[PDB]
Design a protein around this ligand. Sequence first.
Ligand SMILES: [Ca+2]
Ligand SMILES: [Ca+2]
Lengths: 17, 149
Amino acid sequence: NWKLLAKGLLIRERLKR
Amino acid sequence: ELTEEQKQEIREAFDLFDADGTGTIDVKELKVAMRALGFEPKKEEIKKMISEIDKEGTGKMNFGDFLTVMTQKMSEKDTKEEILKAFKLFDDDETGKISFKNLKRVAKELGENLTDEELQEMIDEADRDGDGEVSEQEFLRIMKKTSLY
Ligand SMILES: [Ca+2]
Ligand SMILES: [Ca+2]
């Protein structure tokens, strides 16, 4: 849902940098 | 997660409004108190909070009650910022709204496999003002009402 996708993007970004 | 230099700041802020050390401040200095603290509250939010805070219409609040409200508001501000940070990751073309295009690109990058029909269902469900895309307020509203943050 919105929250999984948002959480996904947030993790993906706190990890990359 | 509260801290010490931040607990001590809240105390400072509180004392600005209690120069005579009666141990309370007037519920009316809330907005100014929140601003000194870095917040940018709006009328409705102040109306709402003075009403949560002064449930027994004394017009006054003590330090524990002030500390609460400010800890709570610091947590909400952190949440908002994080929601806003994710807003920007969906709206990567920066049109300031999240489109169907943005959302589909996000699902794919994250390895989902929704149909346009499900993708559209997620827009409609988020799109309250009916302009066919999702504003920040809509996105904030949509997080506000899901599983957990
Ligand atoms: Ca966009
Ligand atoms: Ca909308």
